[PDB]
Structure formats: C-alpha cells, structure tokens
DNA sequence: TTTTTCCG
C-alpha cells in the first residue's frame with residue numbers, strides 16, 4: 269500500500285548513478301522516512317542508518333549518531349582531539365559501509381557532522397570527506413533545529429557561521445544535491461495541510477489559524493500527550509502511573525555527579541502495565557535508546573518489559589560515569605513514556621494527540637506538534653494556537669534561496 | 683527550555 273512516486277523513482281536513480289551526497293527533504297509526512305527504508309531495501313549498497321534522537325533512529329531502523337560514531341556530549345571544535353577508540357567490530361562495520369543514511373537531519377549540529385567526517389577519515393585513513401562514503405541525509409529544516417545551549421553556541425560561534433547541519437566545515441570540501449518529496453501522505457485534509465504548511469514557512473495568517481480554534485480544550489489512554497517541556501511530560505506520566513501497586517527504585521549516586529547532570533530517574537516509579545522507554549543502547553541484548561515497551565513484571569533487581577517490537581527484555585541496573593572518572597550513578601535505564609517531548613515526537617505519526625504548547629521556545633516546535641497527527645479532529649491543545657508560537661529562523665530562508673538559485677546544490681561543487 | 687557516546 270506504499271505508493272512509489274515519480275519523485276521517489278528519480279531520487280533512487282540519482283543516488284545509484286551519481287556518487288554525490290544528497291539531502292532529501294520535504295514537508296512533514298511526505299514519506300521521507302518511508303522512502304528511506306525503501307531506498308535501502310532496494311539499493312544494492314551496504315547502508316548504515318542513524319539519526320540524532322533515539323526515537324527517530326528506531327523509527328528509521330538505525331541507531332543514534334552518538335552511539336554509531338562514539339561522539340562525546342558537548343561542543344566539539346575542530347581543534348579538540350578525538351579519542352578514536354572504535355572496536356574492531358565497529359571499524360569493520362564502518363569500512364564495509366558504502367552509504368551513510370542520516371534521518372531527521374534538521375536536529376544534527378554542524379560540529380556533529382564534522383566529527384563524523386573526522387572519524388571516518390581516521391577509519392579509512394583517507395583525506396576524502398567522510399572517508400569517501402556517500403552520505404544521504406533526510407529531513408526538514410523547518411522542523412526542530414539541533415539542541416544547543418547558550419554556552420555551546422558561544423563556544424561554537426568561533427568556528428561556525430550558524431548552527432544547522434549545512435554550516436558544517438566539511439561543506440567547504442564537499443557538497444550535496446537537494447531533492448524534495450512534495451506529496452503529503454500523513455494528512456489528507458487540504459485545509460489542514462494548508463495551515464500546517466503556512467505555519468511551517470512562517471506565512472500563516474490570523475484567518476488561516478481560525479481553522480484550529482476547535483483544538484483548545486476539545487471535548488472527548490488513546491490520546492498521546494506531547495509537550496514542549498520535560499516538566500510537563502513528568503507530570504502527565506505520574507498522573508497516568510497512579511498510586512496503585514507502585515514500586516519505587518532509588519538511584520545510587522557515588523561521589524561527584526551533579527543532580528542536573530544525572531541521566532536517569534532519581535526515584536524510578538513503576539507498575540505492571542506502565543508505558544516505558546529504554547534510556548541506553550545494548551545491541552547485544554537487542555535494546556536501544558528510545559525503544560518503547562510495557563512493563564510486565566517488577567522484581568528487586570530486574571524489570572521485565574515487553575517491547576513494542578514483541579521482544580521481552582529483562583532490564584538490570586545500569587551504571588553511568590561522570591568524567592575522569594570521578595563519580596557514577598546506578599539505576600534501571602528506563603523512564604515512563606506515555607507522554608513525550610515534542611523533540612522526541614519528531615518523526616512519529618499518531619491518530620490522536622494532546623499537545624501542550626502554551627509555551628513554545630524553538631523554531632519548528634509548534635509545526636512538529638501539529639503535524640504528528642493524521643487528522644485535524646484528532647488534535648487537542650492546552651492553548652489557542654497563535655502566531656506568537658512561531659519563531660522564524662531567517663538563516664533557513666537564506667539557505668533555501670541559496671540552493672534553489674544555484675542549481676539545487678549546496679557546498680563545494682566537485 | 684530541548685538531546686546525545688563507546689558492542690562482551
């Protein structure tokens with residue numbers, strides 16, 4: 269029931285005939301990730317798939333960029349020395365790879381792409397960008413941008429003219445075609461589609477937004493909550509958890525580990541039937557950051573979860589390090605997940621959603637929230653949708669103007 | 683504000 273469009277066929281043929289890098293873009297729900305999976309299945313190339321968030325990576329069938337390439341947290345400058353500590357298994361996988369596929373490219377920082385370039389040139393012992401691997405990037409720059417803190421932007425501004433993937437320094441040595449998928453599949457209502465598109469490109473009017481008046485406090489566990497803020501996610505999850513038959517698991521912290529740096533729950537509260545997400549990758553055991561499941565049993569030292577993909581996993585406690593090394597913390601690598609942030613929702617489709625957007629603070633955040641849903645009637649909102657929720661990023665206007673006027677190509681022409 | 687590592 270997947271439709272192969274002529275645009276998709278042309279892009280397939282482009283990637284097979286032309287070794288250039290490619291950005292496949294298009295609006296929310298235009299079939300980008302669906303086509304990604306088609307491209308790989310049909311290409312004869314060895315492909316590896318990655319994405320910046322764990323949820324998006326799982327949705328595309330791959331792994332996070334940070335896991336695949338062993339990337340540390342925090343900004344990486346071109347002068348920082350990288351630990352090249354790949355196992356032989358990982359080196360071999362990266363050497364066999366012919367095509368690197370990255371989904372949700374909009375959330376990829378430019379220093380992440382440059383780190384990937386540097387690590388691949390080290391693995392391949394080559395001066396070719398990305399070690400000579402062909403890179404195909406999928407996404408929508410008008411959805412969420414990469415997560416950066418103010419201090420990180422300050423550090424990065426010495427080397428980067430902006431904070432989107434196309435600002436990476438590697439694009440002074442290589443470049444990419446931009447191709448687009450222009451048919452929307454996720455939604456089917458033309459007026460809903462028109463308002464989504466005009467929110468996306470900042471052109472929406474007051475009159476167009478009137479279509480969304482029925483969202484706020486709409487009268488109706490089928491509705492999925494997606495929120496701008498983690499504090500809201502935590503409240504909704506605690507509500508849905510309840511107080512019946514709860515088990516609590518306390519973190520053990522050992523020495524230095526600021527509380528604002530702890531990656532896990534301080535007091536993990538669970539029950540049988542609880543919707544949860546894995547926080548860590550363990551490919552040997554078949555689980556990965558962002559994988560979703562349902563708790564089926566709780567014990568002293570083991571939490572049993574039936575994953576959405578049908579696997580039952582027995583989670584034991586995991587130990588994080590804060591480094592060199594000074595302190596550590598130990599806790600089950602699980603967190604409740606009925607509710608999720610909008611950043612985590614990017615890439616997913618839902619029939620029924622409740623969005624908490626009374627405070628938006630990222631370009632593309634409102635657009636991602638609304639565009640998750642297949643129909644207008646399936647959205648409930650905590651707030652009236654207004655133009656103040658839209659935050660323009662004019663560097664994206666400049667970028668599209670540049671490539672559209674220069675032959676749908678960006679970066680160094682080869 | 684929001685996110686993210688290293689196959690035993």
Ligand SMILES: Nc1ncnc2c1ncn2[C@@H]1O[C@H](COP(=O)(O)OP(=O)(O)O)[C@@H](O)[C@H]1O
Nearest residue numbers: 269270271296297298299300301302453454617
């Ligand atoms: N080629 C296609 N034919 C039919 N339906 C599609 C196609 N591509 C996507 N869809 C529908 O749209 C939904 C979202 O598509 P997806 O690939 O996730 O969009 P994108 O990654 O562009 O946001 C899918 O769940 C499916 O219902």
Ligand code: ALF
Nearest residue numbers: 295296297615616
């Ligand atoms: F562009 Al998408 F889900 F990947 F809307």
Ligand SMILES: [Mg+2]
Nearest residue numbers: 300301302615
């Ligand atoms: Mg997608």
